[PDB]
Design a protein around this ligand. Structure first.
Ligand SMILES: Cc1cc2nc3c(=O)[nH]c(=O)nc-3n(C[C@H](O)[C@H](O)[C@H](O)COP(=O)(O)OP(=O)(O)OC[C@H]3O[C@@H](n4cnc5c(N)ncnc54)[C@H](O)[C@@H]3O)c2cc1C
Lengths: 6, 666, 133
C-alpha cells in the first residue's frame, strides 16, 4: 500500500 | 467525528446508510420504510459505541438492551438481531476481552486453521468464542508469522510489521486498548543525504519532491484521462508510465528551446534584411552627396537649370537621410529585442544527474511502500486502497509488534513446528496432513469439518507446490494466485551502545548512486528507546541483497552512516540482524501488491471459499469446506496487519454462519 | 480534466514516444540535432550581421546637410516659377518634394500654382512627359 511511504 | 456517528466511522461503516452485508442479513429492514432503517442504523451505531467505549469486557445483548432508550429499546428482537450480527462479523467482542458468559460446556464443529499469523489467530479466537473446536497448525516455532520481532537484552526491533498506519477507523485501535502496545507517533520529517554524505539543500529537496508528486498525478492522468493502460497487448506498469511521463517532460524542455532559438533567428534575419537596406542606402547617400557637392562647386552666377540641380539634389539627399534615420530607429528596436530574448532563455535541462538521483530516492520510497519494483505495479490499480486509508498519525509499537500475536495466542490449541503438506477436502469433510519440521518423517493427520487456509501468497505461489490440494484448486483460484503480485522488502537492525544521530529525527534517507541501486539501504529508522537504527532495503535491491552476507550488508550500512555523521562517530554495532523474506520458506516474500494485469477483484477471488464435488454422483450440492483468510484476501486493506486481522474476523464469521447457522437472519 | 500545471501530456505525444522500443530516444535525438542545427545557424547570421554593421560605421554624418530655415513667401519670383516647372518635370504630383525644392512655398501654394499657371506653363504637357519615365 501507499500508506507505508515515508 | 464523535458520538454514535463516530462509532460507525471507527468501525469503517457509513453512519447514515446500510451496507451490502447488512442488506443481506436484514432484507426486511433495508427494503422497508425509511423510518425503520434509521432505528436500525441507530441501534447498530449505539451498540458499536458501547463496545468501543469499553473494549476490555464482552458486550452482551443484556448489557446492550439495558443502555438503549425508547423507541429504540421497544423492539427487543431487532436489538437481538443487530447484536448477534455485530458479534458474528466481529465488529463487537473481537480480540482480547473478559468473558461474562464462560464458554459453552460442549463444542460444535471442528476447524483446522493453517498458520498462526495474525489472520489465523484472529479467526481462531472468534471461532472459539462461537463454541467451535479449533486447532492452528504453525510451521514456525513461534506465532505471529510476518509479525516478527527481534529481542535481545533491551534491544527490541521489528523485522516484519512495524507501523500502525493511523488509529482513525483502525481495528488495531481497539486491540491497542486491550493489549499493552507502547504506541509512539512518528515525526514525518525526513532529511536526505546524497552519495557523498552531505544533506540535500532545502532548495533542491522541496523542488524535487514537488516534481515527484507532480509526476505521480501525471501517471494518474495518463491512466484515467488518456486511457494509457495497454501497450503491445501487455498491461502498462507504473514504472513504464513514469518513464513515458519523464520523457515527455524532457521532450517539452527541448521543444521550448527549439522555438526560443527559432524566435532569435527570425529576429536576427529581420535585422539582416534591414542592414542590407541600410548599406544599400548609405551607398546611394555617398554617391548623391558627391553629386550635390559637384553641383555646388559650380559657383554662380548660374542659369536656372544649374540652380535647380543644386536644389533638387539637396531635397533628394535630405529625403534619403530621412529614410536612413527611420531605419536606424527600427535597427535600435530590433537590436534590443534580441538582447531581450538572449537574456532570459527557457530551461536548460528537465532534471540534472544530481536531480535525477534524488528523484530516484522518492521512487525507492514508493518501491518500499509497495515492496516491489515500480515496473511490476499496475498503473490503473496500484493505489486502489487509497480511499480506505485511516486518519491520524502513524505510530510504531515501541515494545515490539509480537506482543500482539502472542496476546491473541493465549488459550488456543496451536501446534508449532507443524508443516502442512497436503489439504484433502471432500463432501463429507476434510483431512490435513502435516509433518514435524524437525524430524520430517513423523507424520500427523487432522480430521475436520472445515479448513481455514492462511498461507501467504508467496507460499500459495510455490512451484513445485509446498502444499498440495486434493482435489486441485480450481483454475479461477490458481489464476488469481499467479496474477497477483507478492512483493519483497528487507530490514537491517543495527544495535549500538550510544546515540550518534539526531534524537528528534525518526527517519532519514540516503540517496543512492544509480537508478539500479536506489532501494539499497535508502532509509533509516530511529524509533525505539534503545540505541537502534533500522535500515530498509527496497525495490530491485531487496531481492539481490539476500544473496549477500550480513557482514557485507552491515559494512555498507556503516559506510553510509560514517559519511553522514562522521567517520569516527559511528562505532561498531553490538548486535546485527538481516531479514530475508523471499528466502523464508514460510513467507516466500513480504506482502502482496497489485501487479500489472491484476486488480482489486483478484483479492475478492482469493477470499472466495471452495466447495468440493459430491461423493456419490447425484447427491445434493455440498457445504463449502476450504476457506481463505490473510493479508492477500482483503481487497480494501491488503498488505497490512489490520487487513489480515480483519480477514480472519471475516472468515470466522462466514464459517460460523455455515456450521452453526445464522439465527439473526429471521 | 487537465494535466498538472507545468506537466505536458497530449494524446498525440504519448503515441509518438511509445510507437516502438526506441521511439523515445529517436524523438529526443531528432530534437537534439534540430537544436544544434538552429544554434549554429544563429552564430552564422550573427557573423553576417557583425560584418554588415562594420560597413555602416560612421553612419551618415559626413553626408548630412545643415538645416535651412526660410519663411514662407506669397510672391512668385520669375526664378521661383522656373524652379517649379522643373520640379514638376522631375517629381510630377509630389507637391511636398516641389515645395522643398523651391524652399519658400507652402504645399497649398504649390497646388494653387498648378491651377493658376496651368495654360501658361503647359503643365498638362509637363506632367505627361513625367509619366513617360
Ligand atoms: C518487512 C515487512 C514489514 C511490514 N510492515 C508492516 C507495517 O508496518 N504495517 C502493517 O500493517 N503491515 C506490515 N507488513 C505486513 C504484515 O506483517 C502482514 O500483512 C501480516 O502480518 C500478514 O498476516 P497473515 O496472517 O495474513 O500472514 P502471516 O503472518 O504470514 O501468517 C501465515 C502463517 O502461516 C505459516 N505457514 C506458512 N507455510 C506453512 C505450512 N506449509 N504449514 C503451516 N504453516 C505455514 C507461517 O509461518 C505464518 O505463521 C509488513 C510485512 C513485511 C514483510
Amino acid at each position: 500500500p501507499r500508506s507505508f511511504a515515508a | 467525528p464523535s458520538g454514535v456517528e463516530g462509532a460507525a466511522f471507527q468501525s469503517r461503516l457509513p453512519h447514515d446508510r446500510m451496507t451490502s452485508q447488512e442488506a443481506a442479513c436484514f432484507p426486511d429492514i433495508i427494503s422497508g420504510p425509511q423510518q425503520t432503517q434509521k432505528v436500525f442504523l441507530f441501534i447498530r451505531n449505539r451498540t458499536l459505541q458501547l463496545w468501543l467505549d469499553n473494549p476490555k469486557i464482552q458486550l452482551t445483548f443484556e448489557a446492550t438492551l439495558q443502555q438503549l432508550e425508547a423507541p429504540y429499546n421497544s423492539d427487543t428482537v431487532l436489538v437481538h438481531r443487530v447484536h448477534s450480527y455485530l458479534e458474528r462479523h466481529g465488529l463487537i467482542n473481537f480480540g482480547i476481552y473478559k468473558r461474562i458468559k464462560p464458554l459453552p460446556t460442549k463444542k460444535t464443529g471442528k476447524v483446522i486453521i493453517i498458520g498462526s499469523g495474525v489472520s489465523g489467530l484472529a479467526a481462531a479466537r472468534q471461532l472459539q468464542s462461537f463454541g467451535m473446536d479449533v486447532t492452528l497448525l504453525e510451521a514456525r516455532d513461534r506465532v505471529g508469522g510476518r509479525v516478527a520481532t527481534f529481542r535481545k537484552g533491551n534491544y527490541v526491533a521489528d523485522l516484519g510489521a512495524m507501523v500502525v498506519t493511523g488509529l482513525g477507523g483502525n481495528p488495531m485501535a481497539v486491540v491497542s486498548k486491550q493489549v499493552n502496545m507502547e504506541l509512539a507517533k512518528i515525526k514525518q520529517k525526513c532529511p536526505l543525504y546524497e552519495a557523498n554524505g552531505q544533506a540535500v539543500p532545502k532548495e533542491k529537496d522541496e523542488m524535487v519532491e514537488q516534481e515527484f508528486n507532480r509526476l505521480l498525478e501525471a501517471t494518474s492522468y495518463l491512466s484515467h484521462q488518456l486511457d494509457f493502460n495497454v501497450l503491445n497487448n501487455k498491461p502498462v506498469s507504473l514504472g513504464q508510465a513514469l518513464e513515458v511521463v519523464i520523457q515527455l517532460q524532457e521532450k517539452h524542455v527541448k521543444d521550448e528551446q527549439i522555438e526560443h532559438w527559432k524566435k532569435i533567428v527570425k529576429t536576427q534575419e529581420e535585422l539582416k534584411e534591414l542592414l542590407n537596406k541600410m548599406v544599400n542606402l548609405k551607398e546611394k547617400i555617398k554617391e548623391l552627396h558627391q553629386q550635390y557637392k559637384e553641383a555646388s562647386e559650380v559657383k554662380p552666377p548660374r542659369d536656372i537649370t544649374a540652380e535647380f540641380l543644386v536644389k533638387s539634389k539637396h531635397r533628394d539627399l535630405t529625403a534619403l537621410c530621412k529614410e536612413y534615420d527611420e531605419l536606424a530607429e527600427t535597427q535600435g528596436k530590433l537590436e534590443e529585442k534580441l538582447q531581450e530574448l538572449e537574456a532570459n532563455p527557457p530551461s536548460d535541462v528537465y532534471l540534472s544527474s544530481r536531480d535525477r538521483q534524488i528523484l530516484d530516492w522518492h521512487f525507492a520510497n514508493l518501491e518500499f511502500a509497495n515492496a516491489t519494483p515500480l515496473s511490476t505495479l499496475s498503473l490503473k490499480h496500484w493505489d486502489q486502497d487509497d480511499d480506505f486509508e485511516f486518519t491520524g498519525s502513524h505510530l510504531t509499537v515501541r515494545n515490539g509488534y509480537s506482543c500482539v500475536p502472542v496476546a491473541l495466542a493465549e488459550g488456543l490449541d496451536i501446534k508449532l513446528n507443524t508443516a502442512v503438506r497436503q489439504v484433502r477436502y471432500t463432501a463429507s469433510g476434510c483431512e490435513v496432513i502435516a509433518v514435524n519440521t524437525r524430524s520430517t518423517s513423523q507424520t500427523f493427520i487432522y480430521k475436520c469439518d472445515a479448513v481455514l487456509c492462511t498461507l501467504p501468497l508467496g507460499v500459495l505461489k510455490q512451484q513445485p507446490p509446498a502444499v498440495q490440494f486434493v482435489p486441485p484448486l480450481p483454475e479461477w483460484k490458481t489464476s488469481a494466485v499467479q496474477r497477483m503480485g507478492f512483493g519483497n522488502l528487507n530490514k537491517v537492525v543495527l544495535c549500538f551502545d550510544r546515540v550518534f544521530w539526531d534524537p528528534s529525527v525518526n527517519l532519514f534517507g540516503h540517496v543512492g548512486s544509480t537508478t539500479a541501486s536506489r532501494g539499497e539501504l535508502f532509509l533509516f529508522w530511529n524509533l525505539y528507546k534503545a540505541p537502534i537504527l533500522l535500515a530498509l532495503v527496497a525495490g530491485e535491491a531487496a531481492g539481490i541483497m539476500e544473496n549477500i552476507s550480513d557482514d557485507v550488508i552491515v559494512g555498507r550500512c556503516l559506510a553510509i552512516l560514517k559519511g553522514i555523521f562522521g567517520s569516527s562517530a559511528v562505532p561498531q554495532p553490538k548486535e546485527t540482524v538481516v531479514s530475508r523474506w523471499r528466502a523464508d520458506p514460510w513467507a516466500r516474500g513480504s506482502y502482496s501488491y497489485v501487479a500489472a494485469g491484476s486488480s482489486g477483484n483478484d483479492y475478492d477471488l482469493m477470499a472466495q471459499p471452495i466447495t468440493p464435488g459430491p461423493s456419490i454422483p447425484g447427491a445434493p450440492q455440498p457445504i463449502p469446506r476450504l476457506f481463505f483468510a490473510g493479508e492477500h484476501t482483503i481487497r480494501n486493506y491488503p498488505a497490512t496487519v489490520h487487513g489480515a486481522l480483519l480477514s480472519g474476523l471475516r472468515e470466522a464469521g462466514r464459517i460460523a454462519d455455515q456450521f452453526l447457522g445464522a439465527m439473526y437472519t429471521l | 480534466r487537465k494535466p498538472p500545471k507545468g506537466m505536458f501530456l497530449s494524446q498525440e505525444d504519448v503515441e509518438a514516444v511509445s510507437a516502438n522500443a526506441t521511439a523515445a530516444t529517436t524523438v529526443l535525438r531528432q530534437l537534439d540535432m534540430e537544436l544544434v542545427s538552429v544554434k549554429r545557424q544563429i552564430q552564422n547570421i550573427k557573423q553576417t550581421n557583425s560584418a554588415l554593421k562594420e560597413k555602416l560605421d560612421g553612419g551618415i554624418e559626413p553626408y548630412r546637410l545643415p538645416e535651412v530655415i526660410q519663411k514662407c513667401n506669397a510672391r512668385w519670383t520669375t526664378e521661383e516659377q522656373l524652379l517649379a516647372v522643373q520640379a514638376i518635370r522631375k517629381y510630377g504630383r509630389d507637391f511636398q518634394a516641389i515645395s522643398d525644392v523651391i524652399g519658400n512655398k507652402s504645399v497649398v501654394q504649390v497646388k494653387n500654382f498648378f491651377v493658376n499657371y496651368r495654360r501658361r506653363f503647359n503643365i498638362d504637357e509637363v506632367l505627361q512627359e513625367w509619366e513617360a519615365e
